[PDB]
Structure formats: structure tokens, C-alpha cells
Amino acid sequence: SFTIGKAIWLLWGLVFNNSVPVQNPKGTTSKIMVSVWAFFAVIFLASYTANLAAFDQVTGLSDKKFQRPHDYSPPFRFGTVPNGSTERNIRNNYPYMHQYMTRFNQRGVEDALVSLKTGKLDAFIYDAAVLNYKAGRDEGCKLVTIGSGYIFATTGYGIALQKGSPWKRQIDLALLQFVGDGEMEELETLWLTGICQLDIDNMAGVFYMLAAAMALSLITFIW
């Protein structure tokens, strides 16, 4: 029986309902009001959990994210390197993608690497195995590609000579000797790499409000 002026503790202890006994309610009106307030607290907790629940990126070359990231709220950007055959591969595949690259231009390989390390770049189109090497030599396995080149172009490398060179057949036989004995597997094993809920600010702000609550409790304790 302390509901003259001290109803704040009872009322905000019946908000969360953390098993805090206060009194024995003999009035029907008080129990009806407590039941309605408890149902309001249950639906408020349901709305609060719904707010907390409501609060690989590109899975294909034909994805709508290459057109526009309008499906999500933060936008991203990407680009390739100039003076390369990747731009000719894009112009042979899609000139629209070449114009997307033309809008979001960039400087170079090391500049895009610094932009990825500092966060000034989201996506970067490059080779398949070389980005796997860069992910393996990455500290902490941070920069991880979306997949490893499943439904991408899947091209290869070669040795280019002049049209009419008599030394081409001997180089071709030397490469067929180098591949077909496990030496190329040894080179791909040796010169490649093989290494590769929590929040901070929210409970910190709750700690600032808790420090204010301790300040208010000290004020109510000294007077």
C-alpha cells in the first residue's frame, strides 16, 4: 500500500515484469488496469523486437545490382583498369557495362588496393586466381571475393609470338613438356599462397545513460 505518490516504482516494475512483488491487489479495477498495462507491455516488447529484427552481395553477371543498387539503401561502385584487355572484353560483352565503367573511373591497381584497404572502393573487377592470391596474403582473411569465378568468363593465359616465328613449335613442345610431368603443378604449389552480433556504440550509449542514472541516484541519495 504505497500508491499515494510512490506509484512510479510499481508501475515501471510492472512494465518489464522481472518478478518484483509489491502488494496484494484486492481491488478488481487495479488488476484489470495491471492486465491491460501488461498486454500493452507485451505488444510493445513485440514491436521492439520487430524493430530490432528489421534493423555474398552480387550473385550473377545478370544481376540487377550491376544496373542500380536501388534494391538496398547504400549504393556501391566499381571499376576496372585502363589500357588493358579487360576493357576490350567488356566492350565485346556489354558496351553498357563499359559506360558504367566510364562513369565510375579509377586510377590504377595500387590505388584501387589502397581504396579497398581504406574503404574508398566497394567492388573491383580483376582476375580470378590473382585475387585469390591477394585474399590469401591478406592479413586476417578480410578481403574475400564473392565466390571464386563460377559463372564468369574463365579465360586463360598464353605465350604470344610473332606471326611467322620459327621458334614457336619448340616453345610449344617445351610448354607441353613443362605441364605434362607435374612441374607446372609444382610451380602452382610453390609460387601461390595457402593461408586464406557484436556491436560497440549501442551498449556504450546505454552505459552513458546508466552513468546518468547513477548520477540521478546519487542526487536522490544525498537529498
Binding site: 580470378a128 571475393t145 613443362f178
Partner: protein, 94 residues
């Protein structure tokens, strides 16, 4: 301001350098290795190439022992060897 420069000697290692040394052991020729000073891999700008394609096609280089990608235009201007590794394309994200 002009095209003046100096011949700086630099050391080379890696995968393609090992391929060059194994071709120098097998075919037994004397390699003349030099870095390109025109630019990146290559893109034709008004019948003017640059890089390794500009060195090979314009009769300034014999072959490209180093890493060189394969597309339609490089299959037209020169001829490639047999493939040895599958290095396609991918996207690095954060």
C-alpha cells in the same frame, strides 16, 4: 617535358621469370629482358597499341614470355601458345 631517360638496371623474380629461366635452360638461348616504358597491358587507340602488344606487333619485340591475357584482338594481331593455367575473372569486394 621531353622523352629523355636513363637505362636503370633492376632485378626480376617471380613466376614468369622462372618460366623464362626454364625456357633459357631448355631452348638454350640468350634472353634480352627489359621492362616496357609505354604503359599497361594494351589498348588500341587509333591504330596505336601500347605495352607488350605494342612491342611485339610493331616489330620491336620477338615474344612475350611474361603473363599476357587472351582476347579476340590479341588472337587477331598475334598467335598464342597452349594454355597452362585457368585464370578467369572475378570481383574483389570488401
Amino acid at each position: 617535358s621531353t622523352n629523355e631517360g636513363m637505362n636503370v638496371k633492376k632485378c626480376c623474380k617471380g613466376f614468369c621469370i622462372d618460366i623464362l629461366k626454364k625456357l633459357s635452360r631448355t631452348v638454350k638461348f640468350t634472353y634480352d629482358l627489359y621492362l616496357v616504358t609505354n604503359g599497361k597491358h594494351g589498348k588500341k587507340v587509333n591504330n596505336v597499341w601500347n605495352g607488350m602488344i605494342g612491342e611485339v606487333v610493331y616489330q620491336r619485340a620477338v615474344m612475350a614470355v611474361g603473363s599476357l591475357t587472351i582476347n579476340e584482338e590479341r588472337s587477331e594481331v598475334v598467335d598464342f601458345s597452349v594454355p597452362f593455367v585457368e585464370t578467369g575473372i572475378s570481383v574483389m569486394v570488401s
